[PDB]
Amino acid sequence: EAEKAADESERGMKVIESRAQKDEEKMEIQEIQLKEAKHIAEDADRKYEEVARKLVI
Amino acid sequence: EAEKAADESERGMKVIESRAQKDEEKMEIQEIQLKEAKHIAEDADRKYEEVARKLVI
Amino acid sequence: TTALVCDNGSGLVKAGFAGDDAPRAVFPSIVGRPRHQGVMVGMGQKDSYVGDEAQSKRGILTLKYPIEHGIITNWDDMEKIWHHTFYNELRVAPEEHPTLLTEAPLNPKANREKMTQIMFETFNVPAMYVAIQAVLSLYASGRTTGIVLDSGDGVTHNVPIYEGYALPHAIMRLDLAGRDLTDYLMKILTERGYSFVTTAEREIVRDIKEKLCYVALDFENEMATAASSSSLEKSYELPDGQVITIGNERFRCPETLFQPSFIGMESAGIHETTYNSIMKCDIDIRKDLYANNVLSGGTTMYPGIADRMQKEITALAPSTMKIKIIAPPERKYSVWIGGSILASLSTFQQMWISKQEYDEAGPSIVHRKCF
Amino acid sequence: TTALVCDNGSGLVKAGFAGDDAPRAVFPSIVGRPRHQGVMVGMGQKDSYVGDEAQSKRGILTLKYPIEHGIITNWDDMEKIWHHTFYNELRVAPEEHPTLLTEAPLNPKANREKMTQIMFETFNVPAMYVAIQAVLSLYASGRTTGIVLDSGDGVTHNVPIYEGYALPHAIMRLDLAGRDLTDYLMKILTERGYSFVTTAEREIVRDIKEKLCYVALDFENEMATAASSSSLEKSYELPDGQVITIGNERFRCPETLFQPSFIGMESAGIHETTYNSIMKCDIDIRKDLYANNVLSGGTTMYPGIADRMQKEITALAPSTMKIKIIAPPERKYSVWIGGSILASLSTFQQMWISKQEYDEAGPSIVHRKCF
Amino acid sequence: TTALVCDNGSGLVKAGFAGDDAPRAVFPSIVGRPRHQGVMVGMGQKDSYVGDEAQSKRGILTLKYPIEHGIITNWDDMEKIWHHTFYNELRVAPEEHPTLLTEAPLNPKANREKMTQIMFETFNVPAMYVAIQAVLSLYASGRTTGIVLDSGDGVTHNVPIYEGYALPHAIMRLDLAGRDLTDYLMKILTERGYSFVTTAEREIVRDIKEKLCYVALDFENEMATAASSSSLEKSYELPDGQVITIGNERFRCPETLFQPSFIGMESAGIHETTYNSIMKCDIDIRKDLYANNVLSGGTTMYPGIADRMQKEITALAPSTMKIKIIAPPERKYSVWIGGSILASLSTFQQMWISKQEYDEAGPSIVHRKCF
């Protein structure tokens, strides 16, 4: 049973680490798109601020 | 030795599941912020067009 | 050959070869010294970090600006800055390159004399020239008349020029500049519970000032809106987290320019000084000066500053006079662009101060008519 | 010649030559004396058993540790330990080998003074140097920044280093260590039926702690699980029989590090002291310290300690920072590896305290720039 | 009716009726909580001890200061402190007595607003007022012009006043105070072998600092004398025994005031901040400010501090300008004396913040002209 548990541990660690590299890639790409979303959000924000100041003047 | 290996693998897979839940709420928050950023930017787009027409007239 | 256009300014050195569209090397003008001892041996830390490198080591360094208000107070630090600019940022030996320097109006003569002496002696440049930071800005705008307001980090000044003829008796200088605004922002941010004391975090406060501060078209109305609503509050991310939200302080910092009394200075606001300078000139050129207002310097980059300045000057000026304010997007680098344009002129090649001339007639050449 | 790196530490003396990948000699720092009379005539038992040999005769000796928390309390015992290390373990004459010694931060100056005096007089070492544990531990980790938490058997201290520059005002020390954990394990084992009092059984309890104890990610959840399930119970074999089974006591002993209130200490847990030390430092380097947290010392070898520490710090720290904990497999011998690396450096050869300097300036010379 | 004057301070609350020569209720501002179990039943133990009572049970309680640096960081504790002051030490119902409070300059607005809200809501006083400590100190001294240095236990600050007019732009605030000196004394006492960690030992260290520490006229000379001779060794007796001996660190602790770099702080010493403040003012009042330097606060009672500060200022100041330092013997209570005097004025009776005014205008009423 110790050897059986060792085999269980080895393929369990293999599957979980495969999922870990998958999730690492996922979080990296989602953080990249998070940065992009923040940049576009602030871009629209201050563009609208400037055009609104132009409108009021 | 086998029992120690199994214990370490069990700890690793508990912590891998814990980081997985962490990643889960991270996707939740980043998805909601991406959605709201998109909405605010696109609303900025409509109002920018409207105020641009106002500025021209 | 080619000429180097160095603009020391204050808080930002920008330099590059003459004839280039934009400056090649731009970096803060600070000197950093390690205030700790160092335990790890063998690294061989240098005793002084100069330029942009000091910005990456703010947490273990004390930063000193060699220029307080236009003038140079620490000559060794300025020499280090010049050496770093010549040998690292540009990687060009100054032995065979004339240099054009810029400085604000109404500065001590010893400053200019010592600058010239250091440049001829330490670096042995073949020739050098000194210019006013305002005339170059006027060149960069493709104009020949009007008044120029150069609001940098150290000093602000107004210089009226008509048809290429400067009017020395109407030049106005005020010591309020970006550094005082940063200090005021540090002071007033305490009321919200945020404390900034170390010189390193002065740079952080400067970053918030650049990113969030803006000029209000009207003061009382904006105060009322901020006190009633909360739509003007914005949040900034510090280098170590704990995002901080600033509201009413957002537009109070840049108002010091129009309200010097906030920081205790008795002098009048920027618009009032400009108006007084406008009338300090003759009466036959006031219309053109009104119609050709020029802005330059980083401090004039606040959003909405142009509209407020125009409104104030129109209120002061007679109704039947057209008022226009020129605010090109590239205010910050306008002075360097003008210097590059001037250095590329063929007729200017005879205005350089040759090394032989300086040796024969001494350091006082710059002040003499051979300007 | 070659340099000699010796680490007295606390509870374990480890020594070897510089440039080696691991200490050659490692043995407990224990001095034992016989407490009985002795009837056989002719064997001629020695009056003092020192080092690992005392472990063999553990059952007829009163083991004493020469040092309580870093500070040496029995100088004669320390001299015996050093003599045994130099002669019976390394079999070398210290008359021709410079010695590098390791000493914890924030200790009485008389300690270092007496250490150097003994080394220079009793053993006539040609030269010697004294270093700090944290710097060596950082050296061995291949890092130049970060905050290092060194937790041995005597004392646990956190030291932040940034770009090779220390932050003395942010160094934190806590007297909780492995010895207190062993004492608490004795105190908590008695509630099950096993009583350990004699100093000989101290070693048995320490071995049980090393072999069975582990750190729980959650305390309340683990206690609830153990209250019902019996899957956490493990058996241990004493050196005579009567195996003993321990349940929840295995993960309760190491909780004292995070819950010092168990043993009456007022201070906070290590996870909180680390965060406090990080917030002591300047704001501009907190991100790097967060991302370069280093662990060292035997007491940090408990399974699952790294995950618990990371979880606690992440809870304390802002959610926008990546907390990374570096736990190399060889935590116990990290300090000695760092000392070997430091002694192997060429530029370090001029930092030794030579015999002539000690003779001229007396024992106090240790407190000069040759810190 | 009569008005109450309460000075919360930082770690020392002093309160009394207005129109008295000295306060009649002085006690530390600490809240103690029992950290142990408690075996005896029926003792009726309380779950929170406040004020001087907690000083008598330091060995079974954990002590918390509700004020870190001027700012109140725990409102429940401060409420308990105020209730104890009003109902036990003074034994007067606050429902029929105006209250005057004091706070340091540059204090966060939220702190003052919450103070006023708690004061009006919980204790339901009819009127209340808040004042800056510097102005009260000036009133107590009987002067009307001169820069005042108020170094308390939580914060130090220099405020210049000329002819009853304050200069906000010249107010300087530094966070170095008595608490930091106590912490530094703790840190440096370990150099001899005395370890103080628990909050109870903080009071012992503070008492040692009060009794023995003194300011040296010169640092290098005194250190040389201490290293050479042994006449500065002084012995203190702990609550139990094992009298401790103190040498050079007797005067090394207060040097942090003039040498903040000891504790890693960037800012300069008080002797330099005072000069910077003096130079920050106008030019035509610098003479009077030089000749009317006023000291206040508990931290300014180190024997010889006045002479050292006078020497430093004279070194900094021009030769032809005379420097005078005023150090009344009642430095600690000067703020309360000034507050009582101010409350005694008949004119000030019209500056009270009536309860109806607060109700109709809300908390913001505090920041309006009724400053």
Ligand SMILES: Nc1ncnc2c1ncn2[C@@H]1O[C@H](COP(=O)(O)OP(=O)(O)O)[C@@H](O)[C@H]1O
């Ligand atoms: N967009 C901006 N908003 C606010 N402040 C700005 C902005 N751009 C530049 N500044 C300020 O201008 C200063 C730089 O002035 P600069 O033009 O370099 O003067 P000099 O030419 O004398 O060096 C900086 O201190 C910065 O705070």
Ligand SMILES: Nc1ncnc2c1ncn2[C@@H]1O[C@H](COP(=O)(O)OP(=O)(O)O)[C@@H](O)[C@H]1O
């Ligand atoms: N695998 C382990 N698990 C738990 N504790 C351990 C382990 N190995 C060693 N220790 C503890 O570490 C201590 C040794 O610390 P050490 O590294 O010698 O400190 P120092 O370097 O100050 O001598 C021992 O007292 C022991 O209790």
Ligand SMILES: Nc1ncnc2c1ncn2[C@@H]1O[C@H](COP(=O)(O)OP(=O)(O)O)[C@@H](O)[C@H]1O
């Ligand atoms: N003779 C003395 N020597 C050294 N320190 C003193 C002396 N007298 C008072 N102190 C310090 O002054 C502090 C009290 O300051 P205090 O005037 O109460 O400030 P606050 O009013 O803000 O509480 C104490 O913490 C103590 O350490």
Ligand SMILES: [Mg+2]
């Ligand atoms: Mg400029």
Ligand SMILES: [Mg+2]
């Ligand atoms: Mg160790």
Ligand SMILES: [Mg+2]
């Ligand atoms: Mg006070």
